[PDB]
Design a protein around this ligand. Structure first.
Ligand SMILES: O=C(O)[C@H]1O[C@@H](O[C@H]2[C@H](O)[C@H](O)[C@H](O[C@H]3[C@H](O)[C@H](O)[C@H](O[C@H]4[C@H](O)[C@H](O)[C@H](O[C@H]5[C@H](O)[C@H](O)[C@H](O)O[C@@H]5C(=O)O)O[C@@H]4C(=O)O)O[C@@H]3C(=O)O)O[C@@H]2C(=O)O)[C@@H](O)[C@@H](O)[C@@H]1O
Length: 227
């Protein structure tokens, strides 16, 4: 009894350029399935026209993964000359009790390393400064280094917020409601990797493994701009 995100033309292009993974990394719906009206409790259109992702459990996800229209997985040069841009209007609801971090947008390499995660966090401490109820950027320092550089981007609001990720040459920038909050962070540690975008809800380290993480997107797109 769920309405499909494909019923809204604002999502046609991104769905044509995506596959949906749930609840782990296995694809449940390819682009053709998504365009044919795929809908489930974990991926549906709300009455006010948001594409909503919902998932329970540690490190589980309901996430779109960037694809080419040819059916090839997106695998662009992480630090190449072509700009790659992901834009999303996201409303992050107050999360259920026991949900502690939800990743909403990623730049991921073609193996096992997230270049960037944008996530909501109940709390975070960075260089001795603790922030609560914020949206955070996490950039991994290397494939062989589990540590990351973390940057608070925004105090959490339930209001629809524009997020824009721009990746070009060895630099990555993030704008939030038009304001640059991460200005040309270095990602040269991914030279010689390939990359793709992801968007949705990816539930990180919950304290209640039965609680549902929930993220809503009013607009979503990923594009290339050729130098
Ligand atoms: O807690 C700490 O100590 C540190 O945590 C750091 O952040 C963590 C996060 O908390 C998450 O755990 C995050 O999880 C990553 C995970 O490390 C892997 O990168 C994994 O990669 C999957 C891909 O997203 C993708 O879904 C892929 O799909 C493939 C798959 O092969 C599929 O079967 C099919 O064949 O093809 C598809 C495809 O489309 O390419 O599968 C990958 C997989 O192996 O599961 O996904 C998550 C993720 O980010 O999505 O990891 C970070 C981390 O950096 O380790 C950080 O906060 C740090 O500061 C802390 O100290």
């Amino acid at each position: 009894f769920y309405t499909a995100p494909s019923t809204e033309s604002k999502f046609t292009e991104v769905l044509s350029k995506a596959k949906l993974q749930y609840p782990t990394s296995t694809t449940v719906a390819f682009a053709d399935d998504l365009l044919d009206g795929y809908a489930a409790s974990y991926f549906y259109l709300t009455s006010d026209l948001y594409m909503q992702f919902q998932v329970a459990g540690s490190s589980q996800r309901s996430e779109l993964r960037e694809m080419e229209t040819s059916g090839d997985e997106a695998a662009w040069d992480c630090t190449g000359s072509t700009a790659h841009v992901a834009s999303a209007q996201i409303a992050i609801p107050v999360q259920e009790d026991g949900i502690e971090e939800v990743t909403i947008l990623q730049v991921h390499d073609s193996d096992v390393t997230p270049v960037l995660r944008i996530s909501w966090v109940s709390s975070i401490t960075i260089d001795g400064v603790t922030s609560e109820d914020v949206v955070l950027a996490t950039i991994r320092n290397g494939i062989d280094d589990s540590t990351a550089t973390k940057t608070v981007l925004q105090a959490h609001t339930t209001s629809r917020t524009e997020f824009n990720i721009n990746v070009q040459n060895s630099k990555l920038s993030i704008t939030v409601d038009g304001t640059t909050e991460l200005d040309e962070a270095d990602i040269s540690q991914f030279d010689g990797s390939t990359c793709y975008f992801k968007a949705g809800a990816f539930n990180n380290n919950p304290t209640d493994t039965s609680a549902n993480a929930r993220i809503k997107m009013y607009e979503l797109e990923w594009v290339d701009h050729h130098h």
